[PDB]
Amino acid sequence: KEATWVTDKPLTLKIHMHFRDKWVWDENWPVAKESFRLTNVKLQSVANKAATNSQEQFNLMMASGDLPDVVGGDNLKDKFIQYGQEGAFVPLNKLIDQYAPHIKAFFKSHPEVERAIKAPDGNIYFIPYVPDGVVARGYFIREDWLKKLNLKPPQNIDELYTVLKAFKEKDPNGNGKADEVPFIDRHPDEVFRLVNFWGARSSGSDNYMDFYIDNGRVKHPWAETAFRDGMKHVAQWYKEGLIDKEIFTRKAKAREQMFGGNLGGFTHDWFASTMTFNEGLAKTVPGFKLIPIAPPTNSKGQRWEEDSRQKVRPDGWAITVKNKNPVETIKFFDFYFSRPGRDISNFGVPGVTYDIKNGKAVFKDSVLKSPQPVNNQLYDMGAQIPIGFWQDYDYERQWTTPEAQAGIDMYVKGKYVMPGFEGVNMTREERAIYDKYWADVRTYMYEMGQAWVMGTKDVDKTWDEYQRQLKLRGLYQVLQMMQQAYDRQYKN
Ligand SMILES: [Ca+2]
The missing domain is CATH 3.40.190.10 (Periplasmic binding protein-like II)
Structure with a gap:
């Protein structure tokens, strides 16, 4: 007993x-x-x-x-x-x-x-x-490279740009080649998260392309004009080679490849696993050292860490x-x-x-x-x-290594982490609309996002049509059912 x-x-x-x-x-x-x-x-x-x-x-x-x-x-x-x-x-x-x-x-x-x-x-x-737990992903940067190039860690979006260009232009790995790739990430969707630096959201939760709540209003970040202005910058960065050309395809082993090869110097990923590369690479890449940094102040004047644990x-x-x-x-x-x-x-x-x-x-x-x-x-x-x-x-x-924990504590103390949207539970009526149109809308957004990043389509030239397609594909009916469910679940 x-x-x-x-x-x-x-x-x-x-x-x-x-x-x-x-x-x-x-x-x-x-x-x-x-x-x-x-x-x-x-x-x-x-x-x-x-x-x-x-x-x-x-x-x-x-x-x-x-x-x-x-x-x-x-x-x-x-x-x-x-x-x-x-x-x-x-x-x-x-x-x-x-x-x-x-x-x-x-x-x-x-x-x-x-x-x-x-x-x-x-x-x-x-x-x-x-x-x-509350902290999910965080920003990491090569301290040894900042060291070589004699630069301090970036405090705002302006310095961030400066530093990443330095990474690509001033040969930090010093092999006399312009083989450096500033931003790398094993999760392609993280490239869209960069719009955070220009005051735009990319998702309401840790789940990619999720809705968010803004003053009791259910909205989808990818439909906001803020996202448009943010993407313009992201696409320019891609054009300048600040973003990994194969960002959408490398995936899974991006860290091992890019860090192991000593090509990348900046990413947004989970604290625990990312910090282990400092030890696992001490051998292969002498002096290799990634440090977590508070998110650089965005154009709107604030430090944003949009990702959080559900x-x-x-x-x-x-x-x-x-x-x-x-x-x-x-x-x-x-x-x-x-x-x-x-x-x-x-x-x-x-x-x-x-x-x-x-x-x-x-x-x-x-x-x-x-x-x-x-x-x-x-x-x-x-x-x-x-x-x-x-x-x-x-x-x-x-x-979790001590170094990772210190990084996590910094994020909790800094209060940069934005609360995520926990979602809503819908009735048969609601769910019917959602299941019929959401997936189509989402894939459409993803394809336009991908093309915008790669410069395949100009964002400003296609934004009005993009908006038109969103309404045409059901975005508005989906949002209305989301709003109805939200009001019932969080406002009653
Ligand atoms: Ca080089």
Whole structure:
């Protein structure tokens, strides 16, 4: 018997969980075993390990009619809410208020998370994966190059331009060639984020090309005239070779290639992984050193870091109408918002991956020193998976180098990070319009954006037509449904 036991008699629940198009709940997972030991509730996987399309597997199950007790996975928010409104998933509101003290208190102190997951009928149909942490990407620059060229780190957009041209013109790698590529980035979409430097937004959240809220108004950044003026500068920079010619194609290994080759000297990427190149390249590129910098003041006079971590993920789990043990299940869910539950779901298994020290879960050196990334070690154990749980940033702090952490603290202290838009949940009516036109509009914008950057089309010559096409393709109907849903969810 454990102090955390949910039931006096061992309870086995059937769960369908398929996530990341490759994994399913594995009851042989060390964490799954520990979870059962601590709650007296065991999860039995009815999902198909061999299936390679998680979203599809969800549908075949839903159609199947024969439902399990619990359904979990990533990117299921939308489906949880729709199949919840037509009665397949049990509303959790009352269940939480009476049997989940930890979940209850969490929502109480994190109202924004609660709003974000509320279906249009006001019900809560799933417990979400709550991530921890605020800073996402940041700006990094070659300090050794600034060193050679004898320049100080840029404080505003003017100096930034000066510095990047220096990088391309004054041969910092000194191989007597003009082979330097100032801005590189493994995520092509980051090139559009550059418009931030001219007071224009490129997205309302960490998701690329997302809507944002401006004075209670749902808007799309790519449709604003601000974006037009920003793109003009971006296209000029591309024309001058300040931006990687292959920005749209290099992708994934851009850092290894460009940094390893000693060609690039500036990027916008995640703190942890980007800073590791300082160590992994000490050998191959002597003196190589990237430093995080506060975002240079933009033309409007402010420091902008548009990217941030979402406060809630569209992942989690729900209770089906067929679950004959709703209160035991909810108490079980609640365990994952309690410290002991947060411990195993974030750190793994005591004695194996961590140990309690000073009342804190502390990873073993073997775990931190391994070339295998901590996240992957945990996934293989059933930890850091898309069930409904409260993530603990301290697990991440432990494998983030001191230099990266200092950079992150600087961003938090600087208050440059803009709050992201957590999205809205739409009714059938609304969703119908969105699903019919959004994708078309989005791809259209992306194609024009790409052409504008590459100079394939002049922005000023095509802006009026671009605006015309946006209205013609449904932008306005999409926004109206977004606005309607927004007013209902955030203004009621
Ligand atoms: Ca050179």
